[PDB]
């Protein structure tokens, strides 16, 4: 069951942007979106790929645990937070592309392809460079496909160990207070048109879970804060969060 609520479009047009929000009520097994078409259009996953990438690296032993330090390679990059040592927690918090590029090289093309098929992730296509295919290669995923993947992760049903899934869900922790917990990952795709931002994850309540996946047009980095801001406005309107 899916229902289209075009009133949410106001949240995008009021900021003179365009995008889609997809919600899934786990208890009721019901979905909601403002745009059924865009909910099924496939985009580059960009840094949302750090979820599956982290899982594969952990399950193959490329990453030992969430404390292992990945030393800065000494190359000054334009993102200040990238020019320092990281572990899995901080690498995902600051979307540290260079750390995950090295993960992918050590994973290798063959094992990466095999695992993405086992995850049923997007179009499962790693065509391109092994260290950048999620940024400018052939892989694609829709918002509805993100939710399908995240639901498997939440229930520990992906084809990796329970430990790997618990560690990645820890690394996804974004916000927690007395009312809800959010585990999620942002994305920012600029190398292939259209330029978009992602935010995918879920909201934990006392007695239910709401999965979400949003993407929106991102002509400039000036609107990146809208990924979370717009999503939370939808959540408040639907009385999922206060
Ligand atoms: O949205 C983020 O969490 C994030 C984290 C790291 C770098 C960037 C970023 C911002 C502007 C340009 C760019 F290429 C990357 C965004
Ligand atoms: Cl946690």
PDB file of C-alpha atoms and ligand atoms in Angstrom:
ATOM      1  CA  UNK A   1       0.000   0.000   0.000  1.00  0.00           C
ATOM      2  CA  UNK A   2       1.281   3.396  -1.095  1.00  0.00           C
ATOM      3  CA  UNK A   3      -0.332   6.815  -0.794  1.00  0.00           C
ATOM      4  CA  UNK A   4       0.745  10.017  -2.549  1.00  0.00           C
ATOM      5  CA  UNK A   5       0.524  13.261  -0.548  1.00  0.00           C
ATOM      6  CA  UNK A   6       1.347  16.175  -2.844  1.00  0.00           C
ATOM      7  CA  UNK A   7       0.803  18.708  -0.047  1.00  0.00           C
ATOM      8  CA  UNK A   8       4.373  17.977   1.049  1.00  0.00           C
ATOM      9  CA  UNK A   9       5.529  19.639  -2.191  1.00  0.00           C
ATOM     10  CA  UNK A  10       5.036  22.948  -0.371  1.00  0.00           C
ATOM     11  CA  UNK A  11       8.061  22.102   1.795  1.00  0.00           C
ATOM     12  CA  UNK A  12      10.229  21.969  -1.336  1.00  0.00           C
ATOM     13  CA  UNK A  13       8.715  24.862  -3.315  1.00  0.00           C
ATOM     14  CA  UNK A  14       8.802  27.195  -0.307  1.00  0.00           C
ATOM     15  CA  UNK A  15      12.595  26.853  -0.549  1.00  0.00           C
ATOM     16  CA  UNK A  16      12.339  27.085  -4.361  1.00  0.00           C
ATOM     17  CA  UNK A  17      13.631  23.530  -4.765  1.00  0.00           C
ATOM     18  CA  UNK A  18      12.279  20.185  -5.969  1.00  0.00           C
ATOM     19  CA  UNK A  19      12.543  16.736  -4.431  1.00  0.00           C
ATOM     20  CA  UNK A  20      10.876  13.685  -2.925  1.00  0.00           C
ATOM     21  CA  UNK A  21      10.363  12.326   0.587  1.00  0.00           C
ATOM     22  CA  UNK A  22       9.462   8.665   1.109  1.00  0.00           C
ATOM     23  CA  UNK A  23       8.184   7.417   4.475  1.00  0.00           C
ATOM     24  CA  UNK A  24       7.565   3.820   5.569  1.00  0.00           C
ATOM     25  CA  UNK A  25       5.575   2.888   8.693  1.00  0.00           C
ATOM     26  CA  UNK A  26       7.053  -0.416   9.845  1.00  0.00           C
ATOM     27  CA  UNK A  27       4.172  -1.401  12.151  1.00  0.00           C
ATOM     28  CA  UNK A  28       1.504  -0.750   9.527  1.00  0.00           C
ATOM     29  CA  UNK A  29       3.574  -1.755   6.464  1.00  0.00           C
ATOM     30  CA  UNK A  30       2.432   1.385   4.644  1.00  0.00           C
ATOM     31  CA  UNK A  31       4.379   3.878   2.557  1.00  0.00           C
ATOM     32  CA  UNK A  32       3.952   7.602   1.889  1.00  0.00           C
ATOM     33  CA  UNK A  33       5.521   9.978  -0.620  1.00  0.00           C
ATOM     34  CA  UNK A  34       4.896  13.324  -2.285  1.00  0.00           C
ATOM     35  CA  UNK A  35       5.950  12.066  -5.730  1.00  0.00           C
ATOM     36  CA  UNK A  36       5.506   8.416  -6.701  1.00  0.00           C
ATOM     37  CA  UNK A  37       7.465   8.980  -9.907  1.00  0.00           C
ATOM     38  CA  UNK A  38      10.541  10.586  -8.368  1.00  0.00           C
ATOM     39  CA  UNK A  39      10.392   8.044  -5.519  1.00  0.00           C
ATOM     40  CA  UNK A  40      11.301   5.391  -8.120  1.00  0.00           C
ATOM     41  CA  UNK A  41      13.813   7.387 -10.192  1.00  0.00           C
ATOM     42  CA  UNK A  42      17.386   6.129  -9.798  1.00  0.00           C
ATOM     43  CA  UNK A  43      20.244   8.439  -8.800  1.00  0.00           C
ATOM     44  CA  UNK A  44      23.872   8.102  -7.824  1.00  0.00           C
ATOM     45  CA  UNK A  45      23.983   7.092  -4.133  1.00  0.00           C
ATOM     46  CA  UNK A  46      27.103   9.244  -3.427  1.00  0.00           C
ATOM     47  CA  UNK A  47      27.942   9.220   0.320  1.00  0.00           C
ATOM     48  CA  UNK A  48      24.855   7.176   1.198  1.00  0.00           C
ATOM     49  CA  UNK A  49      26.974   4.354  -0.236  1.00  0.00           C
ATOM     50  CA  UNK A  50      29.115   4.529   2.898  1.00  0.00           C
ATOM     51  CA  UNK A  51      26.458   2.350   4.564  1.00  0.00           C
ATOM     52  CA  UNK A  52      26.921  -0.691   2.291  1.00  0.00           C
ATOM     53  CA  UNK A  53      30.632   0.090   1.900  1.00  0.00           C
ATOM     54  CA  UNK A  54      31.131   0.059   5.692  1.00  0.00           C
ATOM     55  CA  UNK A  55      29.218  -3.225   6.006  1.00  0.00           C
ATOM     56  CA  UNK A  56      31.313  -4.962   3.352  1.00  0.00           C
ATOM     57  CA  UNK A  57      34.607  -3.663   4.749  1.00  0.00           C
ATOM     58  CA  UNK A  58      33.712  -4.919   8.232  1.00  0.00           C
ATOM     59  CA  UNK A  59      32.479  -8.328   7.087  1.00  0.00           C
ATOM     60  CA  UNK A  60      35.609  -8.973   5.002  1.00  0.00           C
ATOM     61  CA  UNK A  61      37.970  -7.814   7.752  1.00  0.00           C
ATOM     62  CA  UNK A  62      39.170  -4.765   5.818  1.00  0.00           C
ATOM     63  CA  UNK A  63      38.031  -2.835   8.902  1.00  0.00           C
ATOM     64  CA  UNK A  64      38.633  -4.561  12.237  1.00  0.00           C
ATOM     65  CA  UNK A  65      36.186  -2.554  14.374  1.00  0.00           C
ATOM     66  CA  UNK A  66      34.880   0.949  14.975  1.00  0.00           C
ATOM     67  CA  UNK A  67      38.066   1.944  16.838  1.00  0.00           C
ATOM     68  CA  UNK A  68      40.612   1.175  14.103  1.00  0.00           C
ATOM     69  CA  UNK A  69      42.397   4.381  13.107  1.00  0.00           C
ATOM     70  CA  UNK A  70      42.755   5.261   9.420  1.00  0.00           C
ATOM     71  CA  UNK A  71      45.706   7.641   9.300  1.00  0.00           C
ATOM     72  CA  UNK A  72      45.536  10.758   7.140  1.00  0.00           C
ATOM     73  CA  UNK A  73      47.615  10.231   4.003  1.00  0.00           C
ATOM     74  CA  UNK A  74      49.170  13.685   4.353  1.00  0.00           C
ATOM     75  CA  UNK A  75      47.516  15.173   1.260  1.00  0.00           C
ATOM     76  CA  UNK A  76      45.860  18.485   2.080  1.00  0.00           C
ATOM     77  CA  UNK A  77      42.278  18.435   0.777  1.00  0.00           C
ATOM     78  CA  UNK A  78      39.709  21.228   0.666  1.00  0.00           C
ATOM     79  CA  UNK A  79      37.551  19.734   3.452  1.00  0.00           C
ATOM     80  CA  UNK A  80      39.348  20.592   6.686  1.00  0.00           C
ATOM     81  CA  UNK A  81      37.829  17.718   8.699  1.00  0.00           C
ATOM     82  CA  UNK A  82      39.281  15.270   6.153  1.00  0.00           C
ATOM     83  CA  UNK A  83      42.905  16.280   6.909  1.00  0.00           C
ATOM     84  CA  UNK A  84      43.119  14.262  10.106  1.00  0.00           C
ATOM     85  CA  UNK A  85      42.978  10.708  11.402  1.00  0.00           C
ATOM     86  CA  UNK A  86      39.623   8.951  11.473  1.00  0.00           C
ATOM     87  CA  UNK A  87      37.885   5.848  12.669  1.00  0.00           C
ATOM     88  CA  UNK A  88      34.673   4.380  11.275  1.00  0.00           C
ATOM     89  CA  UNK A  89      32.516   6.620  13.485  1.00  0.00           C
ATOM     90  CA  UNK A  90      34.148   9.908  12.506  1.00  0.00           C
ATOM     91  CA  UNK A  91      34.713   8.827   8.892  1.00  0.00           C
ATOM     92  CA  UNK A  92      30.962   8.475   8.424  1.00  0.00           C
ATOM     93  CA  UNK A  93      30.101  11.524  10.534  1.00  0.00           C
ATOM     94  CA  UNK A  94      32.267  13.745   8.272  1.00  0.00           C
ATOM     95  CA  UNK A  95      31.649  11.760   5.023  1.00  0.00           C
ATOM     96  CA  UNK A  96      35.362  11.198   4.570  1.00  0.00           C
ATOM     97  CA  UNK A  97      35.515  10.108   0.932  1.00  0.00           C
ATOM     98  CA  UNK A  98      39.276   9.353   0.852  1.00  0.00           C
ATOM     99  CA  UNK A  99      38.934   6.796   3.675  1.00  0.00           C
ATOM    100  CA  UNK A 100      36.135   4.933   1.887  1.00  0.00           C
ATOM    101  CA  UNK A 101      37.979   5.006  -1.438  1.00  0.00           C
ATOM    102  CA  UNK A 102      40.747   2.994   0.215  1.00  0.00           C
ATOM    103  CA  UNK A 103      38.146   0.596   1.651  1.00  0.00           C
ATOM    104  CA  UNK A 104      36.850  -0.062  -1.878  1.00  0.00           C
ATOM    105  CA  UNK A 105      40.325  -0.673  -3.311  1.00  0.00           C
ATOM    106  CA  UNK A 106      41.008  -3.269  -0.622  1.00  0.00           C
ATOM    107  CA  UNK A 107      37.566  -4.810  -1.121  1.00  0.00           C
ATOM    108  CA  UNK A 108      38.188  -5.035  -4.855  1.00  0.00           C
ATOM    109  CA  UNK A 109      35.811  -5.145  -7.806  1.00  0.00           C
ATOM    110  CA  UNK A 110      34.894  -8.830  -7.625  1.00  0.00           C
ATOM    111  CA  UNK A 111      33.931  -8.951  -3.941  1.00  0.00           C
ATOM    112  CA  UNK A 112      32.180  -5.570  -4.109  1.00  0.00           C
ATOM    113  CA  UNK A 113      30.018  -6.702  -7.030  1.00  0.00           C
ATOM    114  CA  UNK A 114      29.212 -10.011  -5.347  1.00  0.00           C
ATOM    115  CA  UNK A 115      28.155  -8.281  -2.125  1.00  0.00           C
ATOM    116  CA  UNK A 116      25.989  -5.617  -3.767  1.00  0.00           C
ATOM    117  CA  UNK A 117      24.083  -8.386  -5.544  1.00  0.00           C
ATOM    118  CA  UNK A 118      23.651 -10.224  -2.232  1.00  0.00           C
ATOM    119  CA  UNK A 119      22.292  -6.962  -0.749  1.00  0.00           C
ATOM    120  CA  UNK A 120      19.973  -6.427  -3.754  1.00  0.00           C
ATOM    121  CA  UNK A 121      21.357  -2.868  -3.632  1.00  0.00           C
ATOM    122  CA  UNK A 122      20.122  -0.544  -6.367  1.00  0.00           C
ATOM    123  CA  UNK A 123      21.028  -1.685  -9.862  1.00  0.00           C
ATOM    124  CA  UNK A 124      23.984  -3.603  -8.345  1.00  0.00           C
ATOM    125  CA  UNK A 125      26.282  -2.148 -11.023  1.00  0.00           C
ATOM    126  CA  UNK A 126      29.813  -1.118 -10.053  1.00  0.00           C
ATOM    127  CA  UNK A 127      30.763  -0.080 -13.596  1.00  0.00           C
ATOM    128  CA  UNK A 128      33.389   2.646 -13.427  1.00  0.00           C
ATOM    129  CA  UNK A 129      36.484   3.039 -11.264  1.00  0.00           C
ATOM    130  CA  UNK A 130      36.502   0.818  -8.201  1.00  0.00           C
ATOM    131  CA  UNK A 131      37.452   3.791  -6.007  1.00  0.00           C
ATOM    132  CA  UNK A 132      34.788   6.203  -7.294  1.00  0.00           C
ATOM    133  CA  UNK A 133      31.956   4.297  -8.962  1.00  0.00           C
ATOM    134  CA  UNK A 134      29.475   5.562  -6.338  1.00  0.00           C
ATOM    135  CA  UNK A 135      30.452   9.150  -7.275  1.00  0.00           C
ATOM    136  CA  UNK A 136      30.640   9.038 -11.090  1.00  0.00           C
ATOM    137  CA  UNK A 137      30.198   5.408 -12.155  1.00  0.00           C
ATOM    138  CA  UNK A 138      27.151   3.415 -13.164  1.00  0.00           C
ATOM    139  CA  UNK A 139      25.568   2.508  -9.822  1.00  0.00           C
ATOM    140  CA  UNK A 140      22.090   3.891  -9.201  1.00  0.00           C
ATOM    141  CA  UNK A 141      19.475   3.597  -6.459  1.00  0.00           C
ATOM    142  CA  UNK A 142      15.990   5.015  -5.896  1.00  0.00           C
ATOM    143  CA  UNK A 143      14.531   6.384  -2.670  1.00  0.00           C
ATOM    144  CA  UNK A 144      12.188   3.391  -2.404  1.00  0.00           C
ATOM    145  CA  UNK A 145      15.148   1.060  -2.946  1.00  0.00           C
ATOM    146  CA  UNK A 146      17.037   2.852  -0.164  1.00  0.00           C
ATOM    147  CA  UNK A 147      14.164   2.118   2.227  1.00  0.00           C
ATOM    148  CA  UNK A 148      14.095  -1.542   1.178  1.00  0.00           C
ATOM    149  CA  UNK A 149      17.824  -1.805   1.913  1.00  0.00           C
ATOM    150  CA  UNK A 150      17.614   0.052   5.237  1.00  0.00           C
ATOM    151  CA  UNK A 151      14.753  -2.162   6.447  1.00  0.00           C
ATOM    152  CA  UNK A 152      16.931  -5.232   5.928  1.00  0.00           C
ATOM    153  CA  UNK A 153      19.740  -3.552   7.865  1.00  0.00           C
ATOM    154  CA  UNK A 154      17.416  -2.637  10.738  1.00  0.00           C
ATOM    155  CA  UNK A 155      16.259  -6.270  11.064  1.00  0.00           C
ATOM    156  CA  UNK A 156      19.814  -7.714  10.729  1.00  0.00           C
ATOM    157  CA  UNK A 157      18.651  -9.538   7.589  1.00  0.00           C
ATOM    158  CA  UNK A 158      21.443  -8.508   5.213  1.00  0.00           C
ATOM    159  CA  UNK A 159      23.872 -11.244   4.188  1.00  0.00           C
ATOM    160  CA  UNK A 160      26.645 -10.178   6.565  1.00  0.00           C
ATOM    161  CA  UNK A 161      27.212 -10.993  10.226  1.00  0.00           C
ATOM    162  CA  UNK A 162      25.029  -9.518  12.945  1.00  0.00           C
ATOM    163  CA  UNK A 163      28.143  -7.813  14.344  1.00  0.00           C
ATOM    164  CA  UNK A 164      28.815  -5.930  11.100  1.00  0.00           C
ATOM    165  CA  UNK A 165      25.240  -4.648  10.986  1.00  0.00           C
ATOM    166  CA  UNK A 166      25.235  -3.539  14.640  1.00  0.00           C
ATOM    167  CA  UNK A 167      28.498  -1.654  14.143  1.00  0.00           C
ATOM    168  CA  UNK A 168      27.263   0.182  11.046  1.00  0.00           C
ATOM    169  CA  UNK A 169      23.983   1.091  12.774  1.00  0.00           C
ATOM    170  CA  UNK A 170      26.069   2.531  15.614  1.00  0.00           C
ATOM    171  CA  UNK A 171      28.075   4.543  13.092  1.00  0.00           C
ATOM    172  CA  UNK A 172      24.808   5.874  11.607  1.00  0.00           C
ATOM    173  CA  UNK A 173      23.745   7.462  14.902  1.00  0.00           C
ATOM    174  CA  UNK A 174      22.851  11.088  14.126  1.00  0.00           C
ATOM    175  CA  UNK A 175      20.506  12.340  16.846  1.00  0.00           C
ATOM    176  CA  UNK A 176      19.031  11.063  20.091  1.00  0.00           C
ATOM    177  CA  UNK A 177      16.851  12.662  22.747  1.00  0.00           C
ATOM    178  CA  UNK A 178      14.002  11.697  25.038  1.00  0.00           C
ATOM    179  CA  UNK A 179      11.560  11.578  22.126  1.00  0.00           C
ATOM    180  CA  UNK A 180      13.332   9.792  19.264  1.00  0.00           C
ATOM    181  CA  UNK A 181      16.533   8.388  17.803  1.00  0.00           C
ATOM    182  CA  UNK A 182      17.634   9.050  14.217  1.00  0.00           C
ATOM    183  CA  UNK A 183      20.118   6.790  12.440  1.00  0.00           C
ATOM    184  CA  UNK A 184      20.874   8.082   8.962  1.00  0.00           C
ATOM    185  CA  UNK A 185      23.453   9.085   6.356  1.00  0.00           C
ATOM    186  CA  UNK A 186      23.589  12.172   4.135  1.00  0.00           C
ATOM    187  CA  UNK A 187      24.614  12.262   0.491  1.00  0.00           C
ATOM    188  CA  UNK A 188      25.755  14.934  -1.960  1.00  0.00           C
ATOM    189  CA  UNK A 189      26.059  14.016  -5.655  1.00  0.00           C
ATOM    190  CA  UNK A 190      27.591  16.582  -8.039  1.00  0.00           C
ATOM    191  CA  UNK A 191      29.609  14.755 -10.736  1.00  0.00           C
ATOM    192  CA  UNK A 192      26.612  13.598 -12.812  1.00  0.00           C
ATOM    193  CA  UNK A 193      23.511  15.642 -13.551  1.00  0.00           C
ATOM    194  CA  UNK A 194      21.171  16.298 -11.895  1.00  0.00           C
ATOM    195  CA  UNK A 195      23.081  17.433  -8.799  1.00  0.00           C
ATOM    196  CA  UNK A 196      21.192  16.224  -5.714  1.00  0.00           C
ATOM    197  CA  UNK A 197      21.404  15.727  -1.986  1.00  0.00           C
ATOM    198  CA  UNK A 198      20.298  12.625  -0.102  1.00  0.00           C
ATOM    199  CA  UNK A 199      19.215  11.862   3.425  1.00  0.00           C
ATOM    200  CA  UNK A 200      18.258   8.268   4.246  1.00  0.00           C
ATOM    201  CA  UNK A 201      17.677   6.488   7.543  1.00  0.00           C
ATOM    202  CA  UNK A 202      15.011   5.842  10.116  1.00  0.00           C
ATOM    203  CA  UNK A 203      13.363   7.255  13.229  1.00  0.00           C
ATOM    204  CA  UNK A 204      13.125   5.051  16.313  1.00  0.00           C
ATOM    205  CA  UNK A 205      10.119   5.606  18.592  1.00  0.00           C
ATOM    206  CA  UNK A 206       9.100   3.697  21.708  1.00  0.00           C
ATOM    207  CA  UNK A 207       6.716   1.400  19.797  1.00  0.00           C
ATOM    208  CA  UNK A 208       7.392   1.870  16.054  1.00  0.00           C
ATOM    209  CA  UNK A 209      10.019   2.722  13.440  1.00  0.00           C
ATOM    210  CA  UNK A 210       9.625   5.152  10.523  1.00  0.00           C
ATOM    211  CA  UNK A 211      12.055   4.692   7.648  1.00  0.00           C
ATOM    212  CA  UNK A 212      12.755   7.657   5.410  1.00  0.00           C
ATOM    213  CA  UNK A 213      14.564   8.422   2.165  1.00  0.00           C
ATOM    214  CA  UNK A 214      14.715  11.847   0.555  1.00  0.00           C
ATOM    215  CA  UNK A 215      16.552  13.428  -2.330  1.00  0.00           C
ATOM    216  CA  UNK A 216      16.334  16.955  -3.682  1.00  0.00           C
ATOM    217  CA  UNK A 217      17.865  19.208  -6.309  1.00  0.00           C
ATOM    218  CA  UNK A 218      21.154  20.720  -5.112  1.00  0.00           C
ATOM    219  CA  UNK A 219      22.468  23.244  -7.648  1.00  0.00           C
ATOM    220  CA  UNK A 220      24.828  24.677  -4.998  1.00  0.00           C
ATOM    221  CA  UNK A 221      26.228  23.526  -1.676  1.00  0.00           C
ATOM    222  CA  UNK A 222      24.358  26.430  -0.041  1.00  0.00           C
ATOM    223  CA  UNK A 223      21.213  24.299   0.357  1.00  0.00           C
ATOM    224  CA  UNK A 224      22.719  21.202   1.976  1.00  0.00           C
ATOM    225  CA  UNK A 225      21.070  21.965   5.322  1.00  0.00           C
ATOM    226  CA  UNK A 226      17.684  21.574   3.622  1.00  0.00           C
ATOM    227  CA  UNK A 227      18.139  17.810   3.339  1.00  0.00           C
ATOM    228  CA  UNK A 228      17.571  17.406   7.070  1.00  0.00           C
ATOM    229  CA  UNK A 229      15.430  20.519   7.509  1.00  0.00           C
ATOM    230  CA  UNK A 230      12.851  19.523   4.902  1.00  0.00           C
ATOM    231  CA  UNK A 231      12.724  15.911   6.108  1.00  0.00           C
ATOM    232  CA  UNK A 232      12.101  16.973   9.695  1.00  0.00           C
ATOM    233  CA  UNK A 233       9.326  19.338   8.612  1.00  0.00           C
ATOM    234  CA  UNK A 234       7.556  16.410   6.977  1.00  0.00           C
ATOM    235  CA  UNK A 235       8.058  14.328  10.118  1.00  0.00           C
ATOM    236  CA  UNK A 236       6.579  17.066  12.298  1.00  0.00           C
ATOM    237  CA  UNK A 237       3.612  17.544   9.958  1.00  0.00           C
ATOM    238  CA  UNK A 238       2.880  13.818  10.154  1.00  0.00           C
ATOM    239  CA  UNK A 239       3.240  13.931  13.963  1.00  0.00           C
ATOM    240  CA  UNK A 240       6.073  11.409  13.968  1.00  0.00           C
ATOM    241  CA  UNK A 241       8.318  13.789  15.920  1.00  0.00           C
ATOM    242  CA  UNK A 242       7.221  16.757  18.047  1.00  0.00           C
TER     243      UNK A 242
HETATM  244  O1  LIG B   1      27.016  17.469   3.821  1.00  0.00           O
HETATM  245  C1  LIG B   1      27.988  16.954   4.426  1.00  0.00           C
HETATM  246  O2  LIG B   1      27.894  16.279   5.480  1.00  0.00           O
HETATM  247  C2  LIG B   1      29.365  17.165   3.847  1.00  0.00           C
HETATM  248  C3  LIG B   1      30.481  16.587   4.439  1.00  0.00           C
HETATM  249  C4  LIG B   1      31.739  16.793   3.902  1.00  0.00           C
HETATM  250  C5  LIG B   1      31.895  17.580   2.773  1.00  0.00           C
HETATM  251  C6  LIG B   1      30.793  18.176   2.163  1.00  0.00           C
HETATM  252  C7  LIG B   1      30.954  19.056   0.980  1.00  0.00           C
HETATM  253  C8  LIG B   1      30.507  20.375   0.997  1.00  0.00           C
HETATM  254  C9  LIG B   1      30.698  21.203  -0.095  1.00  0.00           C
HETATM  255  C10 LIG B   1      31.336  20.735  -1.230  1.00  0.00           C
HETATM  256  C11 LIG B   1      31.759  19.439  -1.232  1.00  0.00           C
HETATM  257  F1  LIG B   1      32.375  18.958  -2.344  1.00  0.00           F
HETATM  258  C12 LIG B   1      31.587  18.591  -0.169  1.00  0.00           C
HETATM  259  C13 LIG B   1      29.532  17.952   2.713  1.00  0.00           C
HETATM  260 CL1  LIG B   2      23.944   3.116  19.318  1.00  0.00          CL
END
